[PDB]
Amino acid sequence: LPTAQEVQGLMARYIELVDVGDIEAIVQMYADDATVENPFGQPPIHGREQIAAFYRQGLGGGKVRACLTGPVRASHNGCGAMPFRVEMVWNGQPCALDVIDVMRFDEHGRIQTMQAYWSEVNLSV
């Protein structure tokens, strides 16, 4: 599994790919069996093709940015958690969404699970 240090690097790489909106590069970070819950509380999405659709719908339209708002917390079992802020425009309203993602990596360094904690209370104009 990725070490704690490697998890910090991988999760920051993920943020960079979201921030520039490189949909195909994001998808390659995920394993073929990856399970994403985004937002946590909803039915998951499974596998690269379905995960690609999330990012294309979310990032492929208007300009979206993402940046870490604190350090990546990494564990000794290939897992980590990070706080970040997504900026977007929602029907003319400039918005920010505060999110925490929790990720578990597999032994090939790919994302096997991700949970994105956020809801509407985390949105602001």
Next chain:
Amino acid sequence: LPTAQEVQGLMARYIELVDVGDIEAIVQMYADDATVENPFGQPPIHGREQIAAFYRQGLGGGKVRACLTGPVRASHNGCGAMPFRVEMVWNGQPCALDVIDVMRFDEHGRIQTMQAYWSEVNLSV
């Protein structure tokens, strides 16, 4: 089952109790049979007594301080995640540890599970 706003309030209250070292009130925020994984990656501890013993050892003498370093992220299914910083002593000097806790609350508003994401990569001097 706490709404997203209620989760934000409960998790913020937890931080205040840690900051003032109110171990009895912290324990009462947990369900009687809750689990804590702290750090995430270690075996869960189970039940209010083990959880109490954990907070007594970690907080019992001061001068631990704790504060949120960003907003509480909350779901619609009674869960949340928060970034915070703990200030304590390591090797006789003041240190800081960045942590993310993920909590799931029961239908009585008590913490059923807590997972604390951090490792030594999050410890600074």
